[PDB]
Structure 1
Amino acid sequence: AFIILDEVIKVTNRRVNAIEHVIIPRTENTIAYINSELDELDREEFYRLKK
């Protein structure tokens, strides 16, 4: 039981580190990139209308 416990904890430890460092910041950066383009399409339109 010990030897197995020793192997499984090593895998569970890698997964926490992976989701924390890689996954979450990728979701932040991608969201942001798209946000910045997106708001500008709505704004420029209003300026076009006004002109």
Structure 2
Amino acid sequence: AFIILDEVIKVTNRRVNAIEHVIIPRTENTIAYINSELDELDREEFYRLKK
């Protein structure tokens, strides 16, 4: 039981660390980039309509 618990907790802890330190930053940077692009499009659309 000791061995099994040790290996299981090691695996889960490293997985949690990897998720926290990799996934969330990677996705939120993309979120910001997408927001920036969608904000960019409307600017030129408004310019064209103004013209």
TM range (shorter): 0.7 to 0.9
What is the CA RMSD across the aligned residues, in angstroms? 0.9
Structure 2 CA distance, aligned partners of 1:40 and 1:7?
49
Q: CA deviation at 1:29?
A: 0.5
Q: Secondary structure in 2 aligned to 1:39?
A: helix
- Of all paired residues, the percent bearing the same amino acid is 100
Runs of 4+ in 1 over 2 A off after TM superposition: none
Q: CA deviation at 1:33?
A: 1.0
Residue correspondences, number? 51
Q: Is 1:31 the equivalent of 2:31? A: yes
Structure 2 CA distance, aligned partners of 1:30 and 1:48?
28
> TM-score by structure 1 length?
0.87
> TM-score by structure 2 length?
0.87
Unmatched runs of 5 consecutive residues or more in structure 2: none
Q: CA deviation at 1:30?
A: 0.8
Q: CA deviation at 1:39?
A: 0.8
